[PDB]
Amino acid sequence: DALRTLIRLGSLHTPMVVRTAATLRLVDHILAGARTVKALAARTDTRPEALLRLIRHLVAIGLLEEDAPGEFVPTEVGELLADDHPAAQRAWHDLTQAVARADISFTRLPDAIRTGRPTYESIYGKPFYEDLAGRPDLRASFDSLMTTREDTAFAAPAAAYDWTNVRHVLDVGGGKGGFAAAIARRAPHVSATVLEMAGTVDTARSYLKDEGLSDRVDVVEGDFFEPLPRKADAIILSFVLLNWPDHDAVRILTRCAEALEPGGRILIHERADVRFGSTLLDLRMLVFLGGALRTREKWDGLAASAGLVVEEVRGPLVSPNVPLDSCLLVLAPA
Amino acid sequence: DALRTLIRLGSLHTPMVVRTAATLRLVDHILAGARTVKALAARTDTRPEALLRLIRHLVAIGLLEEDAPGEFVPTEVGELLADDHPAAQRAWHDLTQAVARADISFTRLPDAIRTGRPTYESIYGKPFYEDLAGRPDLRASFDSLMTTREDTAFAAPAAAYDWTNVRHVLDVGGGKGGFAAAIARRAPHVSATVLEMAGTVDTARSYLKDEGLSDRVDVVEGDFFEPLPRKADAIILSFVLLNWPDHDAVRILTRCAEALEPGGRILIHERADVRFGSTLLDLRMLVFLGGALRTREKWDGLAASAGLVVEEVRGPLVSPNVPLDSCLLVLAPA
Ligand SMILES: CC[C@@]1(O)C[C@H](O)c2c(cc3c(c2O)C(=O)c2c(OC)cccc2C3=O)[C@H]1C(=O)OC
Ligand SMILES: CC[C@@]1(O)C[C@H](O)c2c(cc3c(c2O)C(=O)c2c(OC)cccc2C3=O)[C@H]1C(=O)OC
Ligand SMILES: Nc1ncnc2c1ncn2[C@@H]1O[C@H](CSCC[C@H](N)C(=O)O)[C@@H](O)[C@H]1O
Ligand SMILES: Nc1ncnc2c1ncn2[C@@H]1O[C@H](CSCC[C@H](N)C(=O)O)[C@@H](O)[C@H]1O
């Protein structure tokens, strides 16, 4: 009992079997009509004997079941590996896309606990975002994964703040601009600017065009460790600061403080440290990037170092469906 | 629900957190009196902030619990990570010992499914047993791990066969000689020979000496792909053949057939393919070694190729305590 529990918790084969199934698009091939192990093997370009041994573990953990002899089909849980499922778990487990690939850094977790430093570079040759800057496929899949974290498409954070006195929003590291878009739909008088890295700026521009928002949201390529491209009344850091150790996060916050208009505020949208998934995201930040999730008291110190104070934390954001784990910290000049 | 289930099954951070805790000997340090995170950090030579983030996940998965503020203790499941626990799970999860280290091969499982070939060499530079031959620390921990698979110390397989008409036993790849020892205690008239690799032969010799069996069990250093050192009435292959692809297993079986006395038998002691843990061991063999677990029908073909027939399979072996997953196949000249 206790022995079986410990063995399952410590098992490396099971998560790699799940990720291999996702990378091979196994459930998609089954749902597209691959009824036999020979057809599945052919569509995935794998050895049939080896694929069957993978399938045997997929059956044992309840992702596949045998309907007829030799005919394997997804269970209710396996169906979440279909590529069009809205939770996007296939892509989140795909070893050729940015996050599951980055998760290999966990194989060197002892080094990260001994040093406090990320292990991603020791495995892939460059730190996380520099590796993405050299790999257009990983840059693109990362940006797409970041748009599948929550089901409101930033509607819930955009609704948690009053935009009446805001004329311009600067979305610092704003990904493909989904947050800037949600504010624009919410608040017709606001204009916005997204500051992002090379590669990402082009998909942000295409996304904002296709929303019909090109006239209201601009995109600037740049580095948020440098002086920001313009001033704004609200400056958004959405899942940015957790990517960075304290001294780097203070540098970013300081650049934002310097770009605030009088009366402006900085909005940090992030999962706060205090259930489910908190330790996964925190340890991801450690081994990918050297970042961390932060408590309120930790945020107080970071803000003070940047000439700011935490005015308000708008607690875990609500959706009609699956709850957002994230919060909105509102920061003002000290 | 289904989403949380899939996310837990696909999680790489949880098994690496367990293995990191085992490698750091975290539970041993707690039980030896490390009551604070600062004391634990000092004994494990880790950063206190990073160690706490590891501990937070260890609490979330139920291996540790907080007794007093800042004082972490093993749960009933965490206690199995104590190094002296008889299930030996600490060593089985220790990333500096041979098996948990080998499990990193699972990070390249897609390659193994595409090619049918093991991934261990692509990661560590040499195939499994050649890597052990160059690493005395891994050779030794592997040999020790192989003595902790079952709780009877080979008493159950030794009791599953009638030794009356056996005068000499050859234990081919017999590890530290634990199986030869169990037969010797069971059957006072039998002498035995263990055939093993360099390094392992010395710990076999020390173990057999310390059992008081040096006069009854010899150890020979050699290669079981070469002609065997002598003939015997029973030739044991205990958790050997699953290490090898079919053609290599046939070579071994053939060497054994050539060394059988008239009326002799070959005993294969292995987990047969047909619950819990079957797919783990099978996929381990794939990615470590290119081996596999085999069904009865597969064994029939291998035996026939070696000039043998399966006479009898003595089904899953029984213990008074935790059941042995293994079986004993009895093979005779065709
Ligand atoms: C179901 C929750 C969630 O889908 C969304 C959660 O927000 C979240 C996840 C993963 C990542 C991030 C997340 O925010 C990142 O912010 C992130 C990052 O920061 C910009 C830089 C690199 C990688 C990641 C990352 O892999 C997922 C999770 O399971 O974690 C518990
Ligand atoms: C609780 C079961 C068990 O403790 C014992 C089970 O017999 C078993 C295990 C691990 C290994 C082997 C086992 O036989 C090997 O034979 C082996 C091997 O073969 C000689 C060569 C390299 C690695 C291994 C190996 O890691 C464990 C397990 O959990 O697997 C489901
Ligand atoms: N120096 C830098 N300058 C500008 N953006 C950077 C940067 N370093 C990292 N980033 C960006 O920071 C982002 C963090 S991922 C978060 C994206 C988006 N805000 C969201 O909530 O979904 C990435 O898109 C990355 O491109
Ligand atoms: N070419 C070879 N010649 C002899 N032994 C070999 C060998 N290749 C691998 N081995 C041995 O095969 C063993 C398989 S592990 C099984 C050990 C033991 N029979 C038990 O049941 O516990 C290892 O000890 C390894 O040293």
Numbering used by the authors:
A (entry chain A), B (entry chain A): 15 to 288, 297 to 356
What did the publication describing this PDB structure actually write?
Tailoring steps catalyzed by SAM methyltransferase-like proteins have yielded particular insight into evolution of anthracyclines and generation of structural diversity. DnrK is a canonical S-adenosyl-L-methionine (SAM)-dependent methyltransferase that catalyzes 4-O-methylation in daunorubicin biosynthesis. Recent studies have uncovered that DnrK is bifunctional and catalyzes additional 10-decarboxylation as a moonlighting activity. Here we have taken advantage of the natural diversity of anthracycline methyltransferases and employed extensive chimeragenesis to probe factors that govern catalysis and substrate recognition.
